[PDB]
Amino acid sequence: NLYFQSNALDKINRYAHGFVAVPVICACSEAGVFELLSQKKSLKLEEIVEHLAANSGHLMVAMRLLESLSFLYRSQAEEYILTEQSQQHQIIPKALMSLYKYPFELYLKGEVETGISNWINCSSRRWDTENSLLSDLLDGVLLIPLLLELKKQNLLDESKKIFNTLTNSLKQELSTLFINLGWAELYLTDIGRFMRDRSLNLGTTASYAPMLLQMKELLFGNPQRVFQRNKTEKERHVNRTLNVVASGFQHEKFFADTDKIIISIFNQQPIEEQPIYIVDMGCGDGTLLKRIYKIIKQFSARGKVLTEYPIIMVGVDYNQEALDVTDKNLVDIPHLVIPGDIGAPEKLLEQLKAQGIEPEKVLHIRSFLDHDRPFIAPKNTEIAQARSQLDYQVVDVDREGKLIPPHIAVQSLVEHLERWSSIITRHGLLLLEVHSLTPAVVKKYIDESESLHFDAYHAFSMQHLVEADVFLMAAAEVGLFSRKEAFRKYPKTLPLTRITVNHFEKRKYQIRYATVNDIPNLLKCATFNPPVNEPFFQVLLKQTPTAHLLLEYQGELVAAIFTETKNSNEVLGIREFLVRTSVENWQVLAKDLLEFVEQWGVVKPGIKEIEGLLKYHEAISNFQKSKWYQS
Ligand SMILES: C[S@@+](CC[C@H](N)C(=O)[O-])C[C@H]1O[C@@H](n2cnc3c(N)ncnc32)[C@H](O)[C@@H]1O
Ligand SMILES: [Mn+2]
Structure with a gap:
């Protein structure tokens, strides 16, 4: 120093x-x-x-x-x-x-x-x-x-x-x-x-x-003349060899951040209910799988009893050379290598079942791959339609070099995570990812952050970065929530997020952005502040279309949190808290929503602090004493 x-x-x-x-x-x-x-x-x-x-x-x-x-x-x-x-x-x-x-x-x-x-x-x-x-x-x-x-x-x-x-x-x-x-x-x-x-x-x-x-x-x-793919199908736009070496070296400190998650999972009692299989989609040379096994063996309660309760590491990759390298790297570790593709979790599941693997015993993991999936266009045109009024700033480029509308890029990510969400077990999904920033924030932190060059060469090469808050929202829309105790983000102390380390768990509900279309339902909710009228909702939704969160269960509104963004867009503040006490477990769910709002605000580009957490936590934690309106 x-x-x-x-x-x-x-x-x-x-x-x-x-x-x-x-x-x-x-x-x-x-x-x-x-x-x-x-x-x-x-x-x-x-x-x-x-x-x-x-x-x-x-x-x-x-x-x-x-x-x-x-x-x-x-x-x-x-x-x-x-x-x-x-x-x-x-x-x-x-x-x-x-x-x-x-x-x-x-x-x-x-x-x-x-x-x-x-x-x-x-x-x-x-x-x-x-x-x-x-x-x-x-x-x-x-x-x-x-x-x-x-x-x-x-x-x-x-x-x-x-x-x-x-x-x-x-x-x-x-x-x-x-x-x-x-x-x-x-x-x-x-x-x-x-x-x-x-x-x-x-x-x-x-x-x-x-x-x-x-x-x-x-x-x-x-x-397309820049991105050839000839007979041997070697990439012409990038020296993949130097790229893979360099990115592996950079991915090192982030792999270590999975240690605490793995140690926690494989300390969880009882042993017999822990995962058996750890399945890495896009395993490359198997570095992450190898590290995880050694961490289990040395630092977890599971590692003391592998003789009676073995762990099997599974490398999945769409390239046969990667499977071969991973196979050799996992010598002396019980393992399996199988072909598969980040965009096809349903095919992965059927290939696991063909091996006799019990799907519910699987922990799924992956690092830095969702943004590099083959882009599948949205099939849900209605949800894409609603999404189109939001102010997303994702930049995504198609094979013709044309701009994919931000809301289409987001809907694609949502539908891709939905396909994964449908196979995730109670063991969840360990997922590391890298994220783009908005130009307003890049401009503010040009000397401190890599985004300027990293976001550009990613978008130029037709990869699909999103901002970190967009990613967490896409996961929440399909019921995947990043567990508070497992979460890490980089850079740690700047108001911007380029890397998330997540242990996603599948929950029964979803969280999405509230829209103008939700206003009639919102007017009827119990509310901590005196009942908000339509014009104030319209004001909030117009000023920050992607800053108000609602939790739904089986098509039913359960809770909503509205926010305000102020002071050179550096401060996020809780502004309204709504619930429907007729829904089973609404208080637990409303607390989850406030926890999610905090996590989401922590990765929101440019946000240096969140105001109001203590006040609104007290409101929902002591509900009857807090005297909510329309309850
Ligand atoms: C993302 S880079 C390497 C980083 C690696 N995914 C990791 O886990 O940190 C590409 C590696 O993932 C694999 N990969 C790339 N696209 C894939 C896809 N669509 N489906 C499965 N694996 C893919 C490549 O074959 C290569 O082994
Ligand atoms: Mn990339």
Whole structure:
């Protein structure tokens, strides 16, 4: 915990930002996006799409990135307007895009005709701008592939004398760069060691270089040429090898967060009623399954009695090579590997039954896969219709590169979780997932959070991130609730959620957003505040369409909690509490709703604090004494 680390952390994150942002800015500049918004200053996305013959989905990804960088702003009519910062697009050299295919391997080996001296000189001048952020964005285009190769060839871990075995010209090139950057003084400095030790965190972003090189095709050409799939069906938009290595390394601290959940499950008495099978959908190399088994064996009551009550780990994956690797990795662990697909839980269930596996004895688990499912369009058009008036900000791009409407992306996730919800047992569903943020929050935490680059390259590659609150809502709509004692989120202390660790349990009821359509039923409920009239409900529902929660059981309204969002959208407050005391177990259910509102508010983008929990907990906990109206 040293003083220099806070600036170093900002720098490395900014480098990853620039790795994605510079291709977006350059492609937009070349196609005339900034010029168009200078000739006509207020344009909606559809107008920009039409006039530049753009692909609406990828273009939305680019616009959200530019908004997050404060290059553009959106009016209340959803019209894009340039800012003074957007003139920075003129400072970017467009030859800089050549680095995305420059052979850094050959360069470090002296087998290259043309080196990188021009860019080293550019960096020393801070790219001819005083905007510190901007010069860090451009630095990232160069430094990310270079640092990764310097680490890969073991040119930085070398004791003391780094660059000592390189040709003298190479020595001076990299010595100048490292000295100019404060990385070396020839010995590495504090920041120099920091950048080297943390290089693999850039691997996932760096692996999308082939896609980012083709940004102009994504935005303005034929997106499918970027995503080939030839005969061997190797991915062309990403170096999956480096990607899988890097993401596995990053997924490490999150796997450890399943320890407390696993320890809790397999300490639960009696042993015979615990799960027998732990089934990981998308097992990859089996790292998570292997860890879980060792945790059970060493740290749980179940681990003392495996002789009498064995555990069986089950790896499921739609790729046979993954099953083979997982099979080998789970040597000496009782296990099974079977094919399956994240989108087909019904087929998984039938394959388990074909093995004689008793479905009710299964704990289902998975990590970081729901957002990478094959997108299935909504079949429930009526629920999709209702959903369409809500203000979701999910960005999701289809195979043609067109924008999937946010409410359609959400309804797809709901229906996909419903298919899973129908097979989840009383042992529940251990689920880790990564989430996108809104541009308002990304803009506010640009130096502290990875979202700017991570959300962009995810949406560009046709993955389906949602914001963390949207995910928890989609689960709640189908009766899956993330258990309070198991939950973890990252980042821990910033008002934004990029990662959730969940133990979902299946409950008999559902929680969804209240809508204007619910107002007649809401008017009839018992209510802690004096009875609310329709206009105030309309006011609340109009101002924050996705901030009021209701709990339903067998089509019957049980309870509802309305909220207010205030103070630069940093404070969420409980505003109304409604119940129907005619429904069996309504008080327990209403307490569950208030607990859910707290969890949901904890992951709501931008929310720093929740007000009113004590007041409204007391209201429902001492119901008769609190003297509710219309009871
Ligand atoms: C998401 S990445 C690896 C991360 C891994 N899912 C985990 O558990 O952390 C892809 C891995 O999941 C598998 N996978 C990708 N799409 C899948 C799908 N639709 N159904 C089942 N497995 C899938 C891949 O074959 C690969 O093994
Ligand atoms: Mn992903």
